[PDB]
Design an enzyme around this catalytic site. Structure first.
Site, PDB file in Angstrom:
ATOM      1  N   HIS A  73       0.809  -1.222   0.000  1.00 55.65           N
ATOM      2  CA  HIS A  73       0.000   0.000   0.000  1.00 55.65           C
ATOM      3  C   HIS A  73       0.837   1.265   0.000  1.00 55.65           C
ATOM      4  O   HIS A  73       0.852   2.019   0.971  1.00 55.65           O
ATOM      5  CB  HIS A  73      -0.979  -0.009   1.171  1.00 55.65           C
ATOM      6  CG  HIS A  73      -2.062  -1.026   1.017  1.00 55.65           C
ATOM      7  ND1 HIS A  73      -2.026  -2.255   1.640  1.00 55.65           N
ATOM      8  CD2 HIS A  73      -3.193  -1.014   0.268  1.00 55.65           C
ATOM      9  CE1 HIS A  73      -3.098  -2.947   1.300  1.00 55.65           C
ATOM     10  NE2 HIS A  73      -3.820  -2.218   0.465  1.00 55.65           N
ATOM     11  N   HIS A  77       1.334   1.217  -5.773  1.00 50.48           N
ATOM     12  CA  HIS A  77      -0.024   0.729  -5.834  1.00 50.48           C
ATOM     13  C   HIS A  77      -0.979   1.870  -6.205  1.00 50.48           C
ATOM     14  O   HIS A  77      -1.906   1.686  -6.990  1.00 50.48           O
ATOM     15  CB  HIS A  77      -0.409   0.097  -4.496  1.00 50.48           C
ATOM     16  CG  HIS A  77      -1.872  -0.178  -4.356  1.00 50.48           C
ATOM     17  ND1 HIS A  77      -2.536  -1.095  -5.137  1.00 50.48           N
ATOM     18  CD2 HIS A  77      -2.794   0.334  -3.510  1.00 50.48           C
ATOM     19  CE1 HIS A  77      -3.807  -1.125  -4.788  1.00 50.48           C
ATOM     20  NE2 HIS A  77      -3.990  -0.273  -3.796  1.00 50.48           N
ATOM     21  N   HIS A 113      -6.711   7.130  -2.702  1.00 51.88           N
ATOM     22  CA  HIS A 113      -7.492   6.087  -2.041  1.00 51.88           C
ATOM     23  C   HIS A 113      -6.780   5.294  -0.929  1.00 51.88           C
ATOM     24  O   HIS A 113      -7.440   4.707  -0.088  1.00 51.88           O
ATOM     25  CB  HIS A 113      -8.099   5.137  -3.073  1.00 51.88           C
ATOM     26  CG  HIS A 113      -7.250   3.940  -3.348  1.00 51.88           C
ATOM     27  ND1 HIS A 113      -6.223   3.951  -4.267  1.00 51.88           N
ATOM     28  CD2 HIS A 113      -7.260   2.698  -2.811  1.00 51.88           C
ATOM     29  CE1 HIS A 113      -5.635   2.766  -4.283  1.00 51.88           C
ATOM     30  NE2 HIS A 113      -6.245   1.987  -3.410  1.00 51.88           N
ATOM     31  N   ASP A 114      -5.452   5.243  -0.939  1.00 53.56           N
ATOM     32  CA  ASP A 114      -4.706   4.540   0.117  1.00 53.56           C
ATOM     33  C   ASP A 114      -3.676   5.438   0.816  1.00 53.56           C
ATOM     34  O   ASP A 114      -2.764   4.940   1.475  1.00 53.56           O
ATOM     35  CB  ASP A 114      -3.979   3.283  -0.432  1.00 53.56           C
ATOM     36  CG  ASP A 114      -4.859   2.034  -0.407  1.00 53.56           C
ATOM     37  OD1 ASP A 114      -5.783   1.996   0.424  1.00 53.56           O
ATOM     38  OD2 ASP A 114      -4.635   1.105  -1.212  1.00 53.56           O
ATOM     39  N   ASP A 231      -8.774  -1.465  -7.984  1.00 51.34           N
ATOM     40  CA  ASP A 231      -8.102  -1.799  -6.738  1.00 51.34           C
ATOM     41  C   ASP A 231      -7.849  -3.298  -6.666  1.00 51.34           C
ATOM     42  O   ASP A 231      -6.887  -3.748  -6.043  1.00 51.34           O
ATOM     43  CB  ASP A 231      -8.979  -1.368  -5.561  1.00 51.34           C
ATOM     44  CG  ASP A 231      -8.204  -1.210  -4.262  1.00 51.34           C
ATOM     45  OD1 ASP A 231      -6.960  -1.037  -4.303  1.00 51.34           O
ATOM     46  OD2 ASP A 231      -8.862  -1.213  -3.194  1.00 51.34           O
ATOM     47  N   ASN A 234      -4.880  -6.609  -9.810  1.00 51.83           N
ATOM     48  CA  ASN A 234      -3.595  -7.303  -9.888  1.00 51.83           C
ATOM     49  C   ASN A 234      -3.659  -8.662 -10.592  1.00 51.83           C
ATOM     50  O   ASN A 234      -2.828  -8.946 -11.442  1.00 51.83           O
ATOM     51  CB  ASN A 234      -2.969  -7.517  -8.501  1.00 51.83           C
ATOM     52  CG  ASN A 234      -2.635  -6.217  -7.783  1.00 51.83           C
ATOM     53  OD1 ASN A 234      -2.395  -6.220  -6.569  1.00 51.83           O
ATOM     54  ND2 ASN A 234      -2.613  -5.108  -8.516  1.00 51.83           N
ATOM     55  N   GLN A 282      -4.030 -17.217  -3.367  1.00 49.44           N
ATOM     56  CA  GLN A 282      -4.303 -16.520  -4.623  1.00 49.44           C
ATOM     57  C   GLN A 282      -5.458 -17.183  -5.376  1.00 49.44           C
ATOM     58  O   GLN A 282      -6.389 -16.501  -5.822  1.00 49.44           O
ATOM     59  CB  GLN A 282      -3.047 -16.432  -5.492  1.00 49.44           C
ATOM     60  CG  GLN A 282      -2.039 -15.387  -4.990  1.00 49.44           C
ATOM     61  CD  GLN A 282      -2.693 -14.031  -4.728  1.00 49.44           C
ATOM     62  OE1 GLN A 282      -3.346 -13.473  -5.610  1.00 49.44           O
ATOM     63  NE2 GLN A 282      -2.541 -13.513  -3.511  1.00 49.44           N
ATOM     64  N   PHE A 285      -8.578 -16.339  -3.499  1.00 52.17           N
ATOM     65  CA  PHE A 285      -8.878 -14.927  -3.718  1.00 52.17           C
ATOM     66  C   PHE A 285      -9.551 -14.724  -5.088  1.00 52.17           C
ATOM     67  O   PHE A 285     -10.583 -14.051  -5.194  1.00 52.17           O
ATOM     68  CB  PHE A 285      -7.573 -14.123  -3.598  1.00 52.17           C
ATOM     69  CG  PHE A 285      -7.749 -12.641  -3.722  1.00 52.17           C
ATOM     70  CD1 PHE A 285      -8.798 -11.995  -3.092  1.00 52.17           C
ATOM     71  CD2 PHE A 285      -6.830 -11.885  -4.436  1.00 52.17           C
ATOM     72  CE1 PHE A 285      -8.946 -10.624  -3.197  1.00 52.17           C
ATOM     73  CE2 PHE A 285      -6.968 -10.524  -4.544  1.00 52.17           C
ATOM     74  CZ  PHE A 285      -8.031  -9.889  -3.923  1.00 52.17           C
TER      75      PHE A 285
HETATM   76  C1  LIG Z   1      -7.475  -8.174   0.567  1.00 53.16           C
HETATM   77  O1  LIG Z   1      -6.697  -9.103  -0.108  1.00 53.16           O
HETATM   78  C2  LIG Z   1      -5.852  -8.736  -1.130  1.00 53.16           C
HETATM   79  C3  LIG Z   1      -5.713  -7.382  -1.453  1.00 53.16           C
HETATM   80  C4  LIG Z   1      -4.868  -7.006  -2.490  1.00 53.16           C
HETATM   81  C5  LIG Z   1      -4.171  -7.967  -3.195  1.00 53.16           C
HETATM   82  C6  LIG Z   1      -3.326  -7.544  -4.252  1.00 53.16           C
HETATM   83  C7  LIG Z   1      -2.609  -8.400  -4.907  1.00 53.16           C
HETATM   84  C8  LIG Z   1      -2.624  -9.825  -4.544  1.00 53.16           C
HETATM   85  O2  LIG Z   1      -1.792 -10.556  -5.050  1.00 53.16           O
HETATM   86  O3  LIG Z   1      -3.582 -10.339  -3.614  1.00 53.16           O
HETATM   87  C9  LIG Z   1      -4.297  -9.314  -2.888  1.00 53.16           C
HETATM   88  C10 LIG Z   1      -5.136  -9.700  -1.853  1.00 53.16           C
HETATM   89  C11 LIG Z   1      -5.260 -11.158  -1.566  1.00 53.16           C
HETATM   90  C12 LIG Z   1      -4.074 -11.650  -0.820  1.00 53.16           C
HETATM   91  C13 LIG Z   1      -4.081 -12.906  -0.263  1.00 53.16           C
HETATM   92  C14 LIG Z   1      -3.178 -13.258   0.874  1.00 53.16           C
HETATM   93  C15 LIG Z   1      -5.202 -13.834  -0.592  1.00 53.16           C
HETATM   94 ZN   LIG Z   2      -5.875   0.042  -2.588  1.00 52.28          ZN
HETATM   95 ZN   LIG Z   3      -7.602   0.556   0.620  1.00 53.86          ZN
END
Ligand SMILES: COc1ccc2ccc(=O)oc2c1CC=C(C)C
Ligand SMILES: [Zn+2]
Ligand SMILES: [Zn+2]
Length: 325
Positions: A73, A77, A113-114, A231, A234, A282, A285
């Site tokens: 952050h 970013h 924003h951050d 946001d 990525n 990942q 996510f």
């Molecule tokens: C809130 O979570 C975020 C927030 C921003 C990013 C940005 C890049 C990224 O590679 O993953 C992100 C994640 C997830 C990370 C994990 C540990 C699952």
């Molecule tokens: Zn952000």
């Molecule tokens: Zn934020």
């Protein structure tokens, strides 16, 4: 090396700009040079009578308030989210949909924003009884702070880039910017997404084949989701960029974890370096947050975002194939 930088900045309108390379070439001024480039491209200095020196001063001040020691952050970013928002705003399905004031709001919101992010979560700040959690009554602590710092810096010497907007413009801009940045709190994700889906389900297009947006609520909803996508963009970038981002967020989560461990606090999810599955996380996510968001977005702007979605999927498979069995 002014020229190598200038060449790299020609990709400002493309998904997958090499933002790390621009950070290096610019002497760690990615946010300043990318914002400046974008404001010139969109003719915002002229349209809103922003003296160029005021713009640069503000941008440097703003960039200076992102923390160089925070791994994710930080100003890079912030630069990335700005440039991504900038690309999303140029999507054919949104052509001439948004006013110049709305465009300025989305881009300024992305820039700030951050800002002044300390590198730890709202929950950490709430648990330690920090002054910030106290002032903000535990609600969207970081996000309220990002806004207040971003606006407050307009008062530094020669920093008021909105000095020449009318009062009505300033009030409208301020409202939009606030609504956008508060929407970046992950705790609002599900509701944002639910609303995006609804909009997609009753999607209307114009005679000229662009999104129809009749009222403030619909307008700000799209802008909120747009910046939320930027946001969370990525995993949708070329894999070499994606992996650097992943490295950086993990480094940042792991510092928080170490801090929680030495303080005797419950360690937050994904912050335990001794107990981590980077790849699987990942994939999780992507499956539960990013892909659901980007697919809905892709439906709204169909078919503008098909290549972004394809890359998302290629990248998921790469991390899947990289989980230790
Ligand atoms: C809130 O979570 C975020 C927030 C921003 C990013 C940005 C890049 C990224 O590679 O993953 C992100 C994640 C997830 C990370 C994990 C540990 C699952
Ligand atoms: Zn952000
Ligand atoms: Zn934020």
């Amino acid at each position: 090396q002014e020229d190598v930088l200038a060449k790299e900045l020609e990709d400002v309108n493309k998904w997958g700009l090499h933002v790390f390379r621009i950070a290096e070439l610019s002497g760690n001024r990615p946010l300043t040079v990318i914002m400046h480039t974008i404001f010139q491209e969109r003719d915002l200095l002229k349209t809103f009578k922003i003296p160029v020196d005021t713009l640069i001063t503000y941008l440097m001040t703003l960039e200076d308030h992102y923390h160089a020691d925070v791994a994710y952050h930080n100003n890079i970013h912030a630069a990335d989210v700005v440039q991504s928002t900038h690309v999303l705003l140029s999507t054919p399905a949104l052509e001439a949909v948004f006013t110049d004031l709305e465009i300025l709001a989305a881009i300024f919101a992305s820039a700030i924003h951050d800002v002044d992010h300390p590198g730890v979560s709202n929950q950490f700040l709430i648990n330690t009884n920090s002054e910030l959690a106290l002032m903000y009554n535990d609600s969207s602590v970081l996000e309220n702070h990002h806004l207040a710092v971003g606006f407050k810096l307009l008062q530094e010497e020669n920093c008021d880039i909105f000095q020449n907007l009318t009062k009505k413009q300033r009030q409208s801009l301020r409202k939009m910017v606030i609504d956008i940045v508060l929407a970046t709190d992950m705790s609002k994700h599900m509701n944002l997404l639910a609303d995006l889906k609804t909009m997609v389900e009753t999607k209307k297009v114009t005679s000229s084949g662009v999104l129809l947006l009749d009222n403030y609520s619909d307008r700000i909803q799209v802008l909120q989701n747009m910046v939320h996508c930027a946001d969370l963009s990525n995993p949708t970038k070329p894999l070499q960029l994606y992996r650097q981002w992943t490295d950086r967020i993990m480094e940042e989560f792991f510092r928080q974890g170490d801090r929680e461990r030495e303080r005797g606090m419950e360690i937050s999810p994904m912050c335990d370096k001794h107990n981590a599955s980077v790849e699987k996380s990942q994939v999780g996510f992507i499956d539960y947050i990013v892909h659901p968001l980007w697919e809905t977005w892709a439906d709204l702007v169909h078919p503008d975002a098909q290549d972004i979605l394809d890359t998302l999927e290629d990248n998921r498979e790469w991390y899947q194939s990289t989980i230790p069995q």
